[PDB]
């Protein structure tokens, strides 16, 4: 009908769905066993987005989890939900790459592509009417960001029609674990724009700015962060889950987000995120939540979009809600900042409604927006890419797999022609 | 006799269908079952008596997203309606007038085609098509102009009314809407023979300033329409001592073969707090559906000039007040007309009040009326889309997409260049010769 | 802690499960089938969505009218009676062409 | 009834609230660091 | 509708609005926990001009409560009436000025303008029609004196047509606690007279002597001095809460009160301050209202208006009462006392009539007053801030801070400048 096939790379990726996936089972009255307990009818009218049919009343994941290391998948098959998964839809190496992209990519990774193929191949002739897949992956590491290229590019030739997703975890700057991490971002990106329908940029310090300064927790966990990502991703496909006045898709949102083939990276950002002393003192609106929104502190990505121009904007909303204080708003936030959007492009703001509120809440909105203060995370990115490699230095892990040096050369080209072409875009009279 | 066909097109034509025919069955006595147990005619322009006694409804509801179909299937009048009727696709168009009209809409043009087929086969002197879509969404938008070029030629003759969302100028449901609104225009242009925008910001306002309704939904707006287009329907379904059918108000508003966009304007619309204290009278109504605030669209009749004026009056109407309002709006300068129809106003009168439908907003009200506007004022819209369609595609954007989907990009100038042609033919039309 | 907000679960706040035995196959052919024995309003208290809040007022049993349920329906009836000749000739050219 | 049926919501949202909040207590209450394994030795 | 936002600098500040936002909870029937508990309908009516709406039937002040120094709010949290601000308004930094306006205003304030015009702009947008801002502060300490005049002079550039009120406090020279007093001082009124639209002059030597005469009390704390101000505070919006038989707001005194942008300092009265053995002798009576305004021992500030000329007179009256004897009162005060009000204006006193009485009590009154004896604080601080400013004492701080010298010689000869013309102002033909 219209369904979905959970790719999944990484630690990274494996906590982060695993997390998701304890949201949409929740969504969905699920038990950590797999049957349905609920009462909610349209909970069940299109379960199969997600799920696949089983004996005796259950109801089976379609994800494929991938890792090149045996330690993580035990976490997940151990955990909350760990035994709702089914054993041979986890597909895992004996062999980690150590976070080199190249090892995942060339060298390592040819000897596993093929299974996690075969898998994805069959949960996608299961399926009448696919709609399309969707990855969630870090830019950091050596599996995700280096195996998860190479999935992608062989099944855009399989199934190019498809739309393919991407919450790719970019690293930051100020936060960084990983020495080699600009070598393997370089060489990724590279991968996205010319394969990926629809990519999301989560940063890790944003999420981190974010439960210190509104969350005010003490002490947060990976867990609170993965919770973030999992409530953003549900917000993308809630309409295709459930009726609303107003429906979309990802694919109604895809062509009314990319005016242009090389730019589909994007700023996820949550509405209503408040802490406990915040939540005796609110009374939740349509205003409240587009105030707590376009706050640029709120937002999920490492970049100030004060500092460019919003392309096309998306808010995708939640809940029961009057849609005269909807479209007056958003037609409000255009007026207002005369400055901050795009003039070639009358009308910025696609806004879709889903009747069905989000889980443990009463109203809710999630949004996607294309700014030019993407491109402030490339070029601070090629600031230090070039500086590893002016002097090729960790450059002989990388060589001996067996790439040349020319690869280098065209990754940061590529990467150096987006930015200069998306700054034109920033510079460009309507009239 | 008399019968119309509803080809509601998209998740507007599909939840405004569903506003007509609860309306509809509430007027008629249908139980939701499909029954009339009360122990002629009337019904027999919209419903269709079974083999077993039960009435069904007329209209093949179209859509190419299933859920906005799976919920009328799940919904009460689930047995009212006969399952078939009911047509879903797999995929939308996703706001893409090409995908509409070239990749997914030759998949279930044929089986639409058939039903409509077996709906007109069941009918034997047929009146009209009510077609309703909205010109935003791609498969209402484009579909729409398939299932239009393809009526043209299976049925030569008949009237085909059309009922459109136009794309407000300033709020906006969609980004890539100006587009297909100007590709689909064509297919309004040389496929309909009449056509009845409307815009949600202007229903907005009005709700808003009458219906003291701050805070509204898709189903306040339904109402309104499914009142108008009961108020069309009402000299077909009840007796009245001027009926009015769908030629003769066909007939007389059209000047030309390329001007077919008259302005609906209903009144009154006030609540029940507001009705309580105001006297209404065929006077009141009839200045009520001049004034500028509660035009249903967003342009402003007093700065261009009416070439026609359909009237329809319905309830405990006399037609001696009917003919002094009628004088009282011709003897005002207010009210500009061409110099080439010196009589304008085209009278029709029912009997039957309209009904209301608790959980509405409109109170009852023992009177009401019905202005039909076909007038010049209405280029500046189209003079706003050819701006911002020229500022879009300028730069090219979202073009990819099309020509991926497969349409030549030449049509896209060949669509703005038809429409401003057409408002040119509208200037011209608004040039006197004095 | 993002979510220890009171959970309220909303369907759970506010029959065909019997039917089709809560399996997804089962109930897109029921659907498909009609067979649903119980409706939004003869389950769920305050209506859910929006076309549900449209069709919330009516009564599923056949020998109801909203007439004698609430009074201001009541509305004179001003119907045209279809006369003999007329339905002699609508049947006629409905069953045969000439 | 809209407004009275709201402030029901509101009311069952301050008793949920309070139910965790005694289960807070309770958990507070417990004590264990096991993680489902003792030092074998131990 | 017509909103007020509650701006707060300052340990006075934040003291004063405590007291003042326990004051009007009172009058509009407010619990500490923040439902509503009152009786009559007109108490929650116009609720939305200084409380906005929370779920439950919860009320939050729209106040922006700030202090460079943490130590305060945590007594603004601990008071009674604490918990019913929003956390999320409190904005304050680690350090504070020290009695420096430098710091404050330029090196220190820096860092918290944007948090606090963040919230300001929060609390303005969410008001549809928001009438105007309003600010209370002392000119003596670091943060109010200080960067409290760094956010008056932005929100004048971003909300040029909103109304601007201080109730700002002034030191006194006879009673001063601060050494850099008239430094601080001298660097205020210069942004005052470029950027408000009304002041009201507040001394706290004047209540000092007015809890020793008028109400006779033996130990008075800051907390009476703050019921004071509060108790003006809340008289001068009453017309604008409640409906009344002559109505007026802020905008209906400022733009009867002032003739030249120039001159907006003021002079506030309440009327009803009587110690406990005099409410045994006394009938309550308008003429005794009046009798108890004109008299300069109840003001509130530090000048004597016989020595100078009323420019213009307002008298805000409060509470049920037949209003013969006010147009006549005010018609006896003018003729009676000719050579105190100046003759190129006729009619110098505007009245206004607010029908619901304030609470625990029938009849009050509050008096906004423009006079000539302003001037006499002025040039007083001139004889300190020049004493102190020929030497170059205690100019090291002020100097390290990065501002030049050449800002006291202007700030010096704006204050020279209006105290000039409004000395010209008195002897006028
Ligand atoms: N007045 C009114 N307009 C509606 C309603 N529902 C949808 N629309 C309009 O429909 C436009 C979008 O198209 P949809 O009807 O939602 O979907 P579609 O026409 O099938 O096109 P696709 O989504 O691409 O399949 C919006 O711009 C709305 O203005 C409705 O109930 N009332
Ligand atoms: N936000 C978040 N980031 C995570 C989580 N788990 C791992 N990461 C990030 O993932 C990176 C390590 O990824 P890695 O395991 O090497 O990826 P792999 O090589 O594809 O398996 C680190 O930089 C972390 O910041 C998580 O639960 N939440
Ligand atoms: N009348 C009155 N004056 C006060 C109160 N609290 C402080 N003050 C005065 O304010 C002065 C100190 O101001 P300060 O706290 O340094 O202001 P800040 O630097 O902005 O915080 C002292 O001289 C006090 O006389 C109060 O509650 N009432
Ligand atoms: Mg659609």
Redesign the interface.
């Given at each position: 009908m219209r369904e979905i096939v959970h790719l999944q790379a990484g630690q990274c990726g494996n906590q982060i769905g695993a997390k998701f996936w304890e949201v949409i089972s929740d969504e969905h009255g699920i038990d950590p066993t797999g049957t349905y307990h609920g009462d909610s009818d349209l909970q069940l009218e299109r379960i199969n987005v997600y799920y696949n049919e089983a004996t005796g009343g259950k109801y089976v994941p379609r994800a494929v989890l991938v890792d090149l290391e045996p330690g993580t998948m035990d976490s997940v098959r151990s955990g909350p939900f760990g035994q709702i998964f089914r054993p041979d839809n986890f597909v895992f190496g004996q062999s980690g790459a150590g976070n080199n992209w190249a090892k995942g990519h060339y060298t390592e990774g040819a000897e596993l592509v093929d299974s996690v193929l075969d898998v994805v191949r069959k949960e996608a002739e299961s399926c009448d009417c696919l709609q399309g897949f969707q990855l969630t992956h870090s830019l950091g590491g050596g599996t995700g960001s280096g195996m998860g290229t190479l999935l992608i590019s062989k099944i855009r030739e399989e199934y190019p029609d498809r739309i393919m997703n991407t919450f790719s975890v970019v690293p930051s700057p100020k936060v960084s674990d990983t020495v080699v991490e600009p070598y393997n971002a370089t060489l990724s990106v590279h991968q996205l724009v010319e394969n990926t329908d629809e990519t999301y940029c989560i940063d890790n310090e944003a999420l981190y700015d974010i439960c210190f300064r509104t969350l005010k927790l003490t002490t947060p966990t990976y867990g609170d962060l993965n919770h973030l990502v999992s409530a953003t991703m549900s917000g993308v496909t809630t309409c295709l889950r459930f009726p609303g006045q107003l429906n979309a898709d990802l694919r109604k949102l895809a062509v009314n987000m990319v005016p242009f083939p090389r730019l589909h990276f994007f700023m996820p950002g949550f509405a209503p995120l408040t802490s406990r002393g915040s939540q005796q003192y609110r009374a939740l609106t349509v205003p409240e939540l587009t105030q707590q929104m376009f706050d640029a502190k709120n937002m999920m990505a490492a970049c100030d979009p004060r500092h460019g121009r919003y392309l096309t904007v998306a808010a995708v909303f939640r809940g029961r809600m009057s849609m005269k204080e909807v479209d007056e708003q958003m037609l409000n936030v255009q007026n207002k900042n005369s400055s901050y959007f795009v003039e070639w492009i009358p009308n910025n703001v696609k806004t879709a409604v889903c009747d069905i509120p989000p889980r443990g809440l009463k109203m809710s909105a999630t949004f996607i927006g294309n700014s030019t203060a993407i491109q402030e995370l490339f070029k601070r990115i090629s600031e230090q890419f070039t500086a590893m490699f002016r002097r090729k230095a960790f450059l002989h892990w990388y060589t001996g797999e067996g790439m040349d040096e020319m690869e280098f050369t065209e990754a940061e080209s590529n990467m150096n022609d987006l930015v200069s072409e998306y700054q034109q875009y920033q510079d460009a009279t309507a009239e | 006799m008399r019968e119309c066909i509803s080809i509601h097109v998209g998740q507007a034509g599909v939840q405004i269908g569903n506003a007509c025919w609860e309306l509809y069955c509430l007027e008629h006595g249908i139980q939701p079952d499909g029954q009339m147990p009360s122990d002629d005619d009337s019904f027999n322009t919209f419903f269709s008596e079974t083999g077993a006694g039960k009435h069904v409804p007329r209209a093949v509801f179209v859509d190419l997203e299933p859920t906005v179909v799976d919920e009328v299937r799940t919904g009460t009048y689930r047995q009212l309606f006969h399952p078939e009727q009911l047509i879903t696709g797999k995929e939308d168009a996703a706001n893409n007038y090409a995908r509409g009209h070239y990749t997914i809409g030759k998949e279930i043009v044929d089986l639409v085609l058939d039903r409509i087929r077996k709906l007109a086969d069941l009918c034997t002197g047929l009146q009209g098509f009510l077609i309703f879509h909205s010109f935003g969404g791609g498969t209402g938008s484009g579909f729409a102009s398939l299932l239009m070029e393809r009526l043209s030629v299976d049925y030569g003759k008949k009237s085909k009314l059309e009922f459109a969302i136009y794309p407000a100028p300033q709020v906006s449901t969609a980004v890539v809407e100006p587009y297909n609104s100007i590709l689909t225009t064509h297919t309004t242009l040389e496929h309909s023979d009449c056509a009845f925008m409307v815009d949600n910001e202007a229903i907005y306002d009005i709700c808003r300033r009458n219906l003291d309704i701050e805070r509204p939904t898709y189903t306040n707006l339904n109402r309104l329409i499914g009142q108008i287009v009961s108020s069309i329907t009402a000299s077909l379904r009840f007796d009245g001592a001027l009926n009015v059918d769908l030629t003769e108000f066909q007939t007389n508003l059209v000047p030309y073969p390329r001007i077919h966009f008259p302005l609906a304007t209903y009144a009154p619309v006030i609540s029940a707090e507001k009705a309580y204290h105001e006297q209404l009278s065929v006077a009141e109504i009839t200045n009520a559906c001049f004034e500028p605030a509660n035009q249903m669209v967003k342009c402003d009749p007093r700065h261009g000039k009416y070439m026609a004026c359909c009237m329809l009056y319905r309830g405990d109407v006399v037609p001696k007040d009917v003919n002094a309002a009628i004088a009282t709006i011709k003897t005002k300068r207010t009210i500009q007309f061409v110099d080439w129809c010196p009589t304008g106003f085209k009278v029709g009168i029912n009997y039957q009040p309209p009904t209301v439908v608790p959980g509405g907003d409109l109170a009852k009200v023992q009177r009401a009326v019905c202005m039909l506007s076909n007038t010049t004022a209405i280029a500046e819209a189209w003079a706003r889309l050819d701006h911002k369609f020229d500022l879009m595609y300028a730069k090219r954007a979202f073009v990819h997409w099309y020509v991926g989907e497969g349409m030549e990009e030449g049509e896209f100038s060949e669509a703005r260049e038809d429409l401003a042609a057409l408002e040119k033919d509208y200037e011209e039309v608004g040039v006197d010769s004095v | 802690n993002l979510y220890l907000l009171g959970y309220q679960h909303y369907f759970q706040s506010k029959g065909n499960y019997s039917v089709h035995q809560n399996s997804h196959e089962r109930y897109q052919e029921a659907v498909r089938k009609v067979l649903l024995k119980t409706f939004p309003n003869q389950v769920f208290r305050v209506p859910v969505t929006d076309a549900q809040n449209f069709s919330f007022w009516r009564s599923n049993i056949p020998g109801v009218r909203p007439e004698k349920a609430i009074p201001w329906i009541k509305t004179p009836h001003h119907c045209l009676i279809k006369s003999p000749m007329t339905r002699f000739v609508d049947h006629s050219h409905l069953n045969d062409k000439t | 009834a809209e407004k009275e049926?709201e402030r029901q919501?509101?009311e069952?949202?301050?008793?949920?609230?309070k139910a965790?909040l005694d289960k807070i207590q309770r958990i507070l209450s417990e004590n264990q660091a096991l993680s489902q394994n003792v030092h074998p030795m131990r």
């Amino acid at each position: 009908m219209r369904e979905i096939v959970h790719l999944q790379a990484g630690q990274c990726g494996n906590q982060i769905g695993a997390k998701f996936w304890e949201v949409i089972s929740d969504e969905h009255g699920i038990d950590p066993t797999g049957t349905y307990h609920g009462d909610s009818d349209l909970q069940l009218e299109r379960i199969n987005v997600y799920y696949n049919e089983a004996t005796g009343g259950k109801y089976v994941p379609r994800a494929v989890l991938v890792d090149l290391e045996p330690g993580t998948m035990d976490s997940v098959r151990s955990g909350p939900f760990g035994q709702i998964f089914r054993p041979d839809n986890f597909v895992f190496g004996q062999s980690g790459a150590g976070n080199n992209w190249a090892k995942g990519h060339y060298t390592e990774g040819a000897e596993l592509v093929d299974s996690v193929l075969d898998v994805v191949r069959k949960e996608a002739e299961s399926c009448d009417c696919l709609q399309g897949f969707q990855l969630t992956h870090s830019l950091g590491g050596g599996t995700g960001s280096g195996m998860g290229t190479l999935l992608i590019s062989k099944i855009r030739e399989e199934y190019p029609d498809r739309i393919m997703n991407t919450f790719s975890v970019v690293p930051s700057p100020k936060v960084s674990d990983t020495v080699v991490e600009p070598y393997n971002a370089t060489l990724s990106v590279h991968q996205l724009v010319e394969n990926t329908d629809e990519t999301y940029c989560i940063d890790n310090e944003a999420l981190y700015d974010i439960c210190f300064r509104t969350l005010k927790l003490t002490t947060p966990t990976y867990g609170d962060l993965n919770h973030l990502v999992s409530a953003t991703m549900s917000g993308v496909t809630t309409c295709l889950r459930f009726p609303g006045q107003l429906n979309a898709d990802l694919r109604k949102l895809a062509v009314n987000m990319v005016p242009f083939p090389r730019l589909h990276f994007f700023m996820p950002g949550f509405a209503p995120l408040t802490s406990r002393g915040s939540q005796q003192y609110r009374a939740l609106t349509v205003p409240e939540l587009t105030q707590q929104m376009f706050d640029a502190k709120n937002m999920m990505a490492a970049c100030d979009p004060r500092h460019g121009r919003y392309l096309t904007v998306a808010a995708v909303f939640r809940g029961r809600m009057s849609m005269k204080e909807v479209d007056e708003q958003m037609l409000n936030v255009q007026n207002k900042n005369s400055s901050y959007f795009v003039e070639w492009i009358p009308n910025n703001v696609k806004t879709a409604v889903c009747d069905i509120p989000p889980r443990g809440l009463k109203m809710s909105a999630t949004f996607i927006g294309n700014s030019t203060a993407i491109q402030e995370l490339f070029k601070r990115i090629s600031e230090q890419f070039t500086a590893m490699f002016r002097r090729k230095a960790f450059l002989h892990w990388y060589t001996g797999e067996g790439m040349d040096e020319m690869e280098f050369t065209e990754a940061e080209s590529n990467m150096n022609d987006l930015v200069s072409e998306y700054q034109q875009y920033q510079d460009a009279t309507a009239e | 006799m008399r019968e119309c066909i509803s080809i509601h097109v998209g998740q507007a034509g599909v939840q405004i269908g569903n506003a007509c025919w609860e309306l509809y069955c509430l007027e008629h006595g249908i139980q939701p079952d499909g029954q009339m147990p009360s122990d002629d005619d009337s019904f027999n322009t919209f419903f269709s008596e079974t083999g077993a006694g039960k009435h069904v409804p007329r209209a093949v509801f179209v859509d190419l997203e299933p859920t906005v179909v799976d919920e009328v299937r799940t919904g009460t009048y689930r047995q009212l309606f006969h399952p078939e009727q009911l047509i879903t696709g797999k995929e939308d168009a996703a706001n893409n007038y090409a995908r509409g009209h070239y990749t997914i809409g030759k998949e279930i043009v044929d089986l639409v085609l058939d039903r409509i087929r077996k709906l007109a086969d069941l009918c034997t002197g047929l009146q009209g098509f009510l077609i309703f879509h909205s010109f935003g969404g791609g498969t209402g938008s484009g579909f729409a102009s398939l299932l239009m070029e393809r009526l043209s030629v299976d049925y030569g003759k008949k009237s085909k009314l059309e009922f459109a969302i136009y794309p407000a100028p300033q709020v906006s449901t969609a980004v890539v809407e100006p587009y297909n609104s100007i590709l689909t225009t064509h297919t309004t242009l040389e496929h309909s023979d009449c056509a009845f925008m409307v815009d949600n910001e202007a229903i907005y306002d009005i709700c808003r300033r009458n219906l003291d309704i701050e805070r509204p939904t898709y189903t306040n707006l339904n109402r309104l329409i499914g009142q108008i287009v009961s108020s069309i329907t009402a000299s077909l379904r009840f007796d009245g001592a001027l009926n009015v059918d769908l030629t003769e108000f066909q007939t007389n508003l059209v000047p030309y073969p390329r001007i077919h966009f008259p302005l609906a304007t209903y009144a009154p619309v006030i609540s029940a707090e507001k009705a309580y204290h105001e006297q209404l009278s065929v006077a009141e109504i009839t200045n009520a559906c001049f004034e500028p605030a509660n035009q249903m669209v967003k342009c402003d009749p007093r700065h261009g000039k009416y070439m026609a004026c359909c009237m329809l009056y319905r309830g405990d109407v006399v037609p001696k007040d009917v003919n002094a309002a009628i004088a009282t709006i011709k003897t005002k300068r207010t009210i500009q007309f061409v110099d080439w129809c010196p009589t304008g106003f085209k009278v029709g009168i029912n009997y039957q009040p309209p009904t209301v439908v608790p959980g509405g907003d409109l109170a009852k009200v023992q009177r009401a009326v019905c202005m039909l506007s076909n007038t010049t004022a209405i280029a500046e819209a189209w003079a706003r889309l050819d701006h911002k369609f020229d500022l879009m595609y300028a730069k090219r954007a979202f073009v990819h997409w099309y020509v991926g989907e497969g349409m030549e990009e030449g049509e896209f100038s060949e669509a703005r260049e038809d429409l401003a042609a057409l408002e040119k033919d509208y200037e011209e039309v608004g040039v006197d010769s004095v | 802690n993002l979510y220890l907000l009171g959970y309220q679960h909303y369907f759970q706040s506010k029959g065909n499960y019997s039917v089709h035995q809560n399996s997804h196959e089962r109930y897109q052919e029921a659907v498909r089938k009609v067979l649903l024995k119980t409706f939004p309003n003869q389950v769920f208290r305050v209506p859910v969505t929006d076309a549900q809040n449209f069709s919330f007022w009516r009564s599923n049993i056949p020998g109801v009218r909203p007439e004698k349920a609430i009074p201001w329906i009541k509305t004179p009836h001003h119907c045209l009676i279809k006369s003999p000749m007329t339905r002699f000739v609508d049947h006629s050219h409905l069953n045969d062409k000439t | 009834a809209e407004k009275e049926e709201e402030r029901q919501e509101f009311e069952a949202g301050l008793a949920a609230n309070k139910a965790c909040l005694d289960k807070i207590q309770r958990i507070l209450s417990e004590n264990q660091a096991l993680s489902q394994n003792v030092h074998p030795m131990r």
